[PDB]
């Protein structure tokens, strides 16, 4: 029994697990809970450092860099190691404190001249797309070479945090265009999380995987085709979510429990005892 | 020491899709809070089989003693316990009547599913839990489930003309679909409401009648608030993201 006790290694693994499952906009509250439950800041700092970084990269946390207008997404595609991240729109690296969500020490970062135009053209089309289609969305576009394939990876984030009204929500989408001329394979995942917690805890978790193709040509024309594909899939996803809500409402939910007995009146609790 | 407060706060934020797993993880994290967490953290109801009477009954912390659970039909523990916690003889008679009454309530409102009621003696009255579980039929490729947990506390007076009732009610509602249009969609969790009032207790208005009205009023209310929160508010929030 004592040989089967929960080790400190297992406690901080659990601590770290809870932290990576914090709802959008509630990292600080889940962290503070876990910090007080574990009651060992040194163990927390050591065993949960990877989880702080994993949360922000998983969540596409947008960060403002002093001196630059556009925010940048914290993603795995930008992880340069040593606590630094790539801003591929401003061609800079920066240090990121995963706890305070603060960027610092921006430095120029080397960038292959090859994909400059293609990444710049997709970034420019996506930025206009995101400003048109989201209330306060942000996007980041990486241009890399994975194996031999020159790849464009587009990430979009959009959140609304209203903790005084006990709800938060976030949309994330991640689009990959693997270039294999005259076409490109398009793979994408769209994610939504919504959390409502006034006298309760209700959460929507949704994701959709996308597989498409597209003919590629010039950098500017292919970026237009890319964004058209994104717009079509994301509009379609959002419409179907709302139709699915309606179906859940008037089919499944109605079938689980009636509003009233068939008498169209509440129960006579003296006749029930009979 | 705010560890229990932090633990309950945590359960309000971690995805309710994993309630069972996170409660066990949480107890691994702070074993000293086990008994407090088992009594204050609602979990999806499980069904067990009373082989003696051939009826289903519902499992929660209130009818648990160690690793056994008490059936509301036979009043016996499974696995068998030699001296498991049981209601007093008089309270047990009220418990049998309550189970029959809420079995009828279940059929009237849910037209299916399973109910269980467990009562226990208090110093100046009694308390009880009313449990209902109903799974959806799977229509239109939607999985649906409903769990009711109604916990009532009854404070009786020496005069026996009036009693104080406090009701704390939780409904857990779970829905999920996997479709080509909307991809995977899991909408789940729970809402909790509380109220209390003094009611006349008389021969024409006995305890079970008073409790049944409180439960029916509360559940009709929570049903409408689930409709509003699940299919109105969270949908509105989704559409405000894009």
């Amino acid at each position: 029994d004592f040989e089967d006790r929960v080790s400190d290694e297992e406690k901080v693994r659990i601590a770290a697990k809870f932290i990576t499952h914090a709802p959008p906009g509630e990292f600080n509250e889940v962290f503070n809970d876990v910090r007080l439950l574990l009651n060992n800041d040194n163990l927390l700092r050591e065993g949960a450092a990877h989880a702080f970084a994993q949360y922000n990269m998983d969540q596409f946390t947008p960060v403002k860099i002093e001196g630059y207008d556009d925010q940048v997404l914290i993603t795995e595609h930008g992880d340069l190691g040593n606590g630094r991240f790539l801003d591929p729109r401003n061609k800079i690296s920066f240090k990121f404190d995963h706890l305070r969500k603060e960027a610092s020490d921006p430095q120029p970062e080397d960038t292959e001249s090859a994909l400059k135009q293609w990444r710049d053209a997709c970034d420019s089309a996506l930025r206009a797309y995101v400003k048109d289609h989201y209330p306060n969305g942000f996007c980041t576009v990486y241009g890399k070479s994975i194996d031999g394939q020159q790849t464009i990876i587009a990430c979009i984030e959009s959140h609304q945090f209203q903790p005084k009204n006990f709800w938060n929500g976030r949309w994330r989408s991640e689009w990959k265009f693997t270039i294999t001329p005259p076409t490109a394979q398009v793979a994408a995942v769209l994610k939504i999380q919504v959390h409502y917690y006034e006298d309760g805890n209700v959460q929507l978790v949704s994701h959709k995987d996308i597989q498409d193709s597209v003919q590629v040509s010039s950098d500017v024309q292919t970026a237009k085709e890319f964004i058209k594909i994104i717009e079509n899939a994301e509009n379609e996803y959002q419409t179907a979510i709302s139709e699915n809500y309606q179906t859940m409402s008037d089919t499944t939910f109605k079938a689980l429990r009636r509003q009233l007995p068939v008498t169209r009146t509440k129960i006579d609790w003296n006749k029930i005892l009979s | 020491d705010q560890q229990l407060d932090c633990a309950l706060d945590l359960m309000r934020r971690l995805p309710p899709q994993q309630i069972e797993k996170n409660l066990s993880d949480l107890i691994d994290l702070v074993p000293s809070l086990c008994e407090d967490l088992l009594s204050s953290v609602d979990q999806p109801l499980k069904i067990a089989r009373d082989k003696v009477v051939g009826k289903d009954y519902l499992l929660c912390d209130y009818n648990r003693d160690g690793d056994s659970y008490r059936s509301p039909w036979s009043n016996k523990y499974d696995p068998p316990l030699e001296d498991g916690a049981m209601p007093s003889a008089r309270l047990r008679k009220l418990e049998v009547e309550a189970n029959n009454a809420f079995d009828q309530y279940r059929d009237l409102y849910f037209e299916g599913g399973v109910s269980s009621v467990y009562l226990w003696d208090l110093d100046h009255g009694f308390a009880g839990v009313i449990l209902i579980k109903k799974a959806g039929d799977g229509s239109k490729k939607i999985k649906g489930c409903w769990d009711s947990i109604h916990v009532v506390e009854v404070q009786e007076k020496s005069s026996g003309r009036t009693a104080h009732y406090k009701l704390t009610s939780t409904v857990m509602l779970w829905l999920q679909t996997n479709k080509t249009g909307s991809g995977t969609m899991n909408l789940g969790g729970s809402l909790t409401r509380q109220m209390e009032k003094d009611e006349t207790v008389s021969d024409s208005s006995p305890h079970i009648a008073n409790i049944g009205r409180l439960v029916e009023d509360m559940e009709n209310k929570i049903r409408s608030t689930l409709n509003e929160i699940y299919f109105g508010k969270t949908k509105d929030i989704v559409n405000g993201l894009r």
Partner: peptide, 12 residues
Amino acid sequence: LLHLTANRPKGP
């Protein structure tokens, strides 16, 4: 956050 289930009666 306010925890309503923490003001319930304790079990048997």
